[PDB]
């Protein structure tokens, strides 16, 4: 496997978005992973509608601005036969009436693949060979809110209690040594003003820090 990966350099990743005051991270994580896989398939990067997911995926077990899961979003896309573009179905950060229209669908999936739970080596393999991967993490700590740069390591982090869904767009290491200071390169959904232009490096191969490999998945396209 590569010692470093950064899917942004290969055109897989849209600009960082902003979920605002809605608990819709799961939808941003899901569209992020789906944007990557659709790009892999077609070579065309198209920003996808988190609002479509928020409004329409309650039958699959999501709860709009009250939370959800990336797997349930990929399932909705499968059962629904599609997902609209952001341009056609824009985000307003509140639960609204489902406006899915099949004629504006620009992505599909056939389900999803779960990465072996807890296994950072499985997660690494997935990142290196598939593309951006949806993950859940423990992001509720003050240290995460205040994050600006470097490798994030929070001794209080849980591998088990995961309150946020984000996107792993690669991995690598700080410094000369490829097995020191390793990190997951993570796209957040709190706008480009947060963290490092909207991104954060999370400690890698440190006992599944903040639960990054606890519940990772990606859509099958």
């Amino acid at each position: 496997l590569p010692k470093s990966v950064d899917w942004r350099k290969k055109g897989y990743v849209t600009p960082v978005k902003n979920q605002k005051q809605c608990g819709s991270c799961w939808a941003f994580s899901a569209t992020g992973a789906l944007e990557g896989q659709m790009f892999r398939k077609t070579g065309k990067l198209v920003s996808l509608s988190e609002q479509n997911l928020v409004d329409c995926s309650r039958p699959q077990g999501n709860q709009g601005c009250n939370g959800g899961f990336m797997a349930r979003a990929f399932q909705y896309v499968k059962e629904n036969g599609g997902l609209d573009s952001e341009e056609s179905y824009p985000y307003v950060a509140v639960d609204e009436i489902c406006k899915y229209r099949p004629e504006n669908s620009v992505a599909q999936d056939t389900g999803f693949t779960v990465v072996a739970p807890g296994k950072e080596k499985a997660l690494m393999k997935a990142v290196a060979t598939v593309g951006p991967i949806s993950v859940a993490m423990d992001a509720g700590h003050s240290s995460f809110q205040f994050y600006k740069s470097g490798i994030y390591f929070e001794p209080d982090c849980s591998s088990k209690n995961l309150d946020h869904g984000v996107l792993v767009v690669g991995y690598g290491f700080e410094g000369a040594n490829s097995d020191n200071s390793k990190y997951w390169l993570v796209k957040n959904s709190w706008g480009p003003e947060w963290g490092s232009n909207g991104y954060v490096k999370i400690a890698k191969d440190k006992n599944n820090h903040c639960g990054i490999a606890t519940a990772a998945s990606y859509p099958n396209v």
Partner: protein, 98 residues
């Protein structure tokens, strides 16, 4: 716990009481009525691009209300905002996202 979901309830701490105090003016504004002290009893948090606190408070006449207070991320330099509230609540009502 789920991504974007609310946490388990936890009994209020002085910080939470503090958030209620800071935000009291805004509530009086919305409801028209004015309050003696509001006792913060319990709360839940929800992580967004910032933080939503859902706080159960007591009006001191055995009346309860549920407040939704948004705390912005570090760089936005914005103070706490009461983004929602529900009135006429039961002491044992579960705090839920709204």
């Amino acid at each position: 716990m789920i991504p974007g979901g609310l946490s388990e309830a936890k009994p209020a701490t002085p910080e939470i009481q503090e958030i209620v105090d800071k935000v009291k003016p805004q509530l009086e504004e919305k409801t028209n009525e004015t309050y003696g002290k509001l006792e913060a009893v319990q709360y839940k948090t929800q992580v967004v691009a910032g933080t939503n606190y859902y706080i159960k408070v007591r009006a001191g006449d055995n009346k309860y209300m549920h407040l939704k207070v948004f705390k912005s991320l570090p760089g936005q330099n914005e103070d706490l905002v009461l983004t929602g509230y529900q009135v006429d609540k039961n002491k044992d009502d579960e705090l839920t996202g709204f």
